[PDB]
Design a protein around this nucleic acid. Structure first.
Lengths: 116, 180, 182, 126, 75, 136, 79
RNA sequence: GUUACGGCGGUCCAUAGCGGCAGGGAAACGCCCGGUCCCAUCCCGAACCCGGAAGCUAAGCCUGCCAGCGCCGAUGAUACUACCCAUCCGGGUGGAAAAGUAGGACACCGCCGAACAC
């Protein structure tokens, strides 16, 4: 939201702190910290700067992160689907693309409720 | 092409004023003022009959020669005060001119022809202002409406200008509109 | 003596580069950075003018000057606004502080904002005076990030002696602005 | 080609100075018995005239141009005190003791104030 | 600027970590709000503040369907 | 019926029926026109009836202009009431028509039907009037 | 019916009290006015109600000065 | 006394303005260089003020070219009009006389000073 290598993403362990990034979960955090030489049991308050630099350059060289990844997602949706594919029609109308009961419970896409 | 400057007698006005003017108009004359680069305006009494004949036979912007007490002075009809009701000429402002003056006037545009039956022609400009020498001012400036569909804004630059004449109006000036 | 980095760079090379790109008949026709203004229009202060003090603190810690609290010129029913109330903190910057802030901005803050895909070169008023805007304040290292409770963006404009967007863009890119190629 | 777009600060300064000169000159005006001591102040020099605005005529002038004051090894304020002394004594020669000070649309301070104080010392009354 | 109105300034030292790039500029971060880390730089001494990414380090423009996917998928 | 969207003053003095018209004395819009020879307040009803009379005497083909708008109110006190108790409320909308003023204009191919249509209009009108031409 | 109108203020007798050439004493009211349709000039002063009064004797002179219409008092030279 | 001139003023404050396109930097006017000092910004040495003389007439300022936009603008005529004549003609007399239009009008005057001349 402000930084890729947020100097304090949140004061807590690294394995779980790096997951405060739109392209990092628990296993990416673990494999990152393994490829580096950084413990995972250590909080972010106890960081250094060189740690942040190696993390930043590793990430920028290996995998994707907030802005570029989110743009990849939205561009995937729009462009690669199209105006009028099936998954695109259902993205457009705000409904579950992957095959789901729309009859009863598609609320995560449809919204809270519009009872008539 | 030239125009024969029509001949007229022009007695000078002795008493000038509204009483003298009205007495003259009752006598059948016309008050006029000859001015220009003469820079010493003359106040004259034309004859209404022949002056009106000249105007209706050679349009408003007419060259004319004035037997001003023997002298034959060349002039143009610059402006006319004509009454609305009577439509009698009340007064003539005349412009001294000479050979190769390139005066500026407001000449009568005239539409003619006939378009498609399914349309109508509206004249937005009674006249067009132009620059030309003061012996070849056209009596009229014609324009044609034969074979012109609706949506044909005929403007002033699209006119057939004679030789020597020069538009001083803008070509954006709409002259004729062809509509439904 | 002790001129700012950006300023000595300017009057050592950038003036000549601008002369070459635009052969100016007179040296005094050369573009130059007149001032930069940081507006921090906070229309959310009308309902409560306690956000203006945070805007003030932020702009001060950024530029180095107490801002001017811009009282509203007019009352607007829709914006919940009366006349005279504190909507906006403005800082004008000239001279050494201007050059220092520009160097800080360019070399620090713009690469510090998230997903910095450049700044638009079309963002010129038509007289070689640039203006862009930001959505937050943490991009400036001068602020303690822990003390940022509310995001508060800004509008930064760089007004120059340039007489057109082209010369303005040349000057800014020469100073080292990130103008993406579009 | 080239075409600057905004009026330069020189034009701004000139027009504004003239505005505020006329502003104070709404109240101030000179006479043969109380002339207007009008000032002009450049960054290089300073000039004063004694005006009788009834006829729009100058009675005595002084300036930091002439060598007797240009030769001073001092500041513009030193030139200003010398100009005040000169216009004071020239006014006394012209038969003047009392004037009204037109600061020319400038701020009364520094060079202008020093000139005025110097003329006040030398004998003029204001 | 006026004396008390304005915050405090002092020439401090911008240190990049990615590149070691080294700038000197006056900043509001000063003896009040500098990282408590002085060093000599030139004929004087200044406090530092550090940066993650700079104009020299940052990958921006100064220094930096799908038949192809389906063909590397299906030969 | 023509009527203005608004007037700054709804209750106005009667327009002065004197003087020959200084403007609108000519055509400037069409080929044939109605010129007035008397002073009169010409109303909405008169204008619309005359326009209609033209548009019925001749049909699709040609154009009509109305060089006067009745923006001058004329009040009317209620009936069965005494003099006084204030000025009446606006009832009629008129246009002060001095002689010379061209009121209606049209452009139509045949002079015969055009002049006859204008005659119908004049007979709808309360004044002695006249056919005029753009030419002279 | 009834009219909501019927009111009017008292006529204030504004105007020009001493025209051009009129010899006036000091303090004489020359112009009663609300604003400055007539401005003050030579030997003429403006009161709180924008009234023009002579500051000295003389004959009233109506003039102009930068578009403003002014009222001036020119002295009457004694023989 | 002469300036492509610097100030201070004036005109029924536009015949003076705006916008031209080509020019000038002698002293001066100016931008301009810096803020140590008086002083100053509801923030900013931008301004105000102060100290200065690196370069530049680019701009302001100034000079010449103008009817391109605005401004001025007669005459004559008309409208209107006091008086008069006239049994409705709002007709007409003798006086005054616009607006608009058109023809045509493009800064001037004074005082001081500066450089030069002298």
């Amino acid at each position: 939201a402000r930084l890729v290598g947020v100097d304090l993403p949140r004061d807590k362990r690294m394995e779980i702190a790096l997951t405060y990034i739109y392209g990092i979960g628990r296993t990416r955090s673990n494999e990152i910290l393994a490829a580096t030489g950084i413990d995972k049991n250590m909080r972010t308050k106890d960081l250094t700067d060189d740690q942040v630099t190696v993390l930043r350059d590793y990430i920028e060289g290996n995998l994707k992160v907030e802005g570029d990844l989110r743009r990849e997602v939205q561009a995937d949706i729009r462009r690669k689907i199209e105006i009028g594919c099936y998954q695109g029609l259902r993205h457009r109308r705000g409904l579950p693309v992957r095959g789901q009961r729309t009859k009863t419970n598609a609320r995560t896409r449809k919204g809270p409720k519009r009872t008539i | 092409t030239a125009n024969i400057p029509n001949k007229l007698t022009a007695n000078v006005r002795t008493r000038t004023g509204k009483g003298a003017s009205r007495q003259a108009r009752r006598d059948g004359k016309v008050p006029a003022v000859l001015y220009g680069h003469g820079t010493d305006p003359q106040h004259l009494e034309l004859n209404a009959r022949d002056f009106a004949a000249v105007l209706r036979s050679h349009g408003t912007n007419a060259i004319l020669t004035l037997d001003i007490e023997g002298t034959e002075q060349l002039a143009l009809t610059k402006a006319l005060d004509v009454h609305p009701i009577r439509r009698n000429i009340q007064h003539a402002d005349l412009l001294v001119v000479q050979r190769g003056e390139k005066v500026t006037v407001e000449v009568t545009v005239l539409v003619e022809g006939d378009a498609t039956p399914g349309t109508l022609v509206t004249q937005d400009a009674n006249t067009i202002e132009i620059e030309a020498e003061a012996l070849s001012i056209p009596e009229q400036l014609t324009v044609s409406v034969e074979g012109v569909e609706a949506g044909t804004q005929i403007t002033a630059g699209q006119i057939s200008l004679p030789e020597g004449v020069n538009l001083i109006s803008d070509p954006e000036l709409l002259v004729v509109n062809v509509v439904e | 003596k002790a001129l700012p980095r950006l300023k000595q760079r300017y009057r050592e090379e950038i003036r000549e580069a601008l002369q070459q790109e635009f052969n100016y008949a007179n040296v005094m026709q050369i573009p130059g950075v007149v001032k930069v203004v940081v507006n921090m229009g906070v229309g959310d202060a009308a309902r409560d003018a306690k956000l203006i003090n945070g805007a003030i603190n932020d702009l001060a810690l950024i530029t180095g000057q107490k801002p001017e609290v811009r009282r509203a010129r007019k009352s607007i029913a829709q914006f919940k606004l009366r006349e005279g109330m504190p909507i906006g903190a403005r800082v004008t910057l000239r001279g050494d502080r201007m050059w220092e802030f520009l160097d800080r901005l360019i070399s620090i803050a713009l690469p510090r904002i998230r997903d910095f895909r450049g700044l638009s070169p079309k963002q010129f008023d038509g007289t070689g005076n640039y203006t862009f805007g930001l959505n937050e304040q943490s991009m400036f290292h001068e602020i303690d990030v822990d003390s940022i409770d509310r995001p508060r963006g800004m509008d930064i404009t760089v007004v120059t002696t340039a007489t057109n967007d082209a010369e303005g863009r040349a000057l800014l890119r020469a100073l080292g602005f990130p103008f993406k190629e579009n | 080609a080239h075409k600057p777009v905004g009026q330069n600060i020189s034009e701004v300064r000139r027009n504004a100075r003239l505005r505020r000169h006329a502003r104070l000159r709404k109240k101030v005006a000179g006479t043969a018995e109380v002339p207007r001591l009008v000032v002009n102040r450049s960054a290089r020099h300073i000039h004063v005239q004694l005006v009788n605005d009834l006829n729009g005529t100058t009675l005595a002038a002084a300036s930091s141009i002439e060598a007797d004051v240009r030769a001073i090894d001092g500041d513009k304020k030193a030139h200003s005190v010398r100009v005040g002394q000169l216009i004071a004594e020239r006014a006394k020669a012209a038969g003047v003791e009392t004037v009204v000070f037109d600061r020319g649309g400038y701020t009364y301070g520094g060079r202008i104030a020093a000139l005025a104080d110097a003329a006040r010392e030398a004998g003029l009354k204001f | 600027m006026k004396p008390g109105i304005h915050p405090d300034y002092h020439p401090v030292v911008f240190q990049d970590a990615a590149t070691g790039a080294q700038f000197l500029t006056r900043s509001t971060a000063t003896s009040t709000r500098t990282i408590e880390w002085p060093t000599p730089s030139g004929p004087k001494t200044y406090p530092l503040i550090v940066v993650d990414v700079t104009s020299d380090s940052h990958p921006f423009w100064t220094g930096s369907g799908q038949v192809e996917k389906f063909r590397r998928r299906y030969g | 019926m023509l009527i203005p969207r608004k007037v700054k003053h709804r209750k106005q003095h009667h327009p002065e029926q004197r003087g020959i018209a200084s403007g609108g004395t000519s055509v400037s819009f069409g080929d044939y026109g109605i010129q007035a020879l008397e002073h009169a307040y010409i109303t909405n009803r008169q204008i619309e009836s005359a326009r209609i009379a033209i548009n019925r005497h001749i049909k699709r083909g040609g154009k009509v202009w109305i060089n006067i708008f009745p923006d001058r109110p004329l009040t009317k006190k209620p009936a069965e009431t005494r003099m006084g108790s204030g000025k009446g409320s606006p009832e009629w909308w008129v246009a002060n028509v001095k002689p010379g003023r061209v009121l209606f204009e049209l452009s139509y191919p045949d002079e015969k039907t055009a002049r006859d249509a204008l005659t119908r209009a004049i007979h709808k009108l309360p004044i002695k009037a006249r056919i005029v031409t753009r030419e002279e | 019916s009834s009219s909501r109108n019927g009111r009017d203020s008292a006529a204030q007798r504004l105007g020009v009290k001493r025209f051009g050439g009129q010899v006036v004493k000091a303090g004489e009211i020359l112009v009663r006015q609300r604003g400055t349709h007539f401005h003050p000039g030579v030997n003429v002063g403006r009161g709180g109600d924008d009234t023009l009064f002579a500051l000295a004797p003389g004959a009233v002179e109506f003039g102009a000065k930068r578009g403003r219409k002014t009222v001036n008092i020119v002295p009457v030279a004694r023989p």
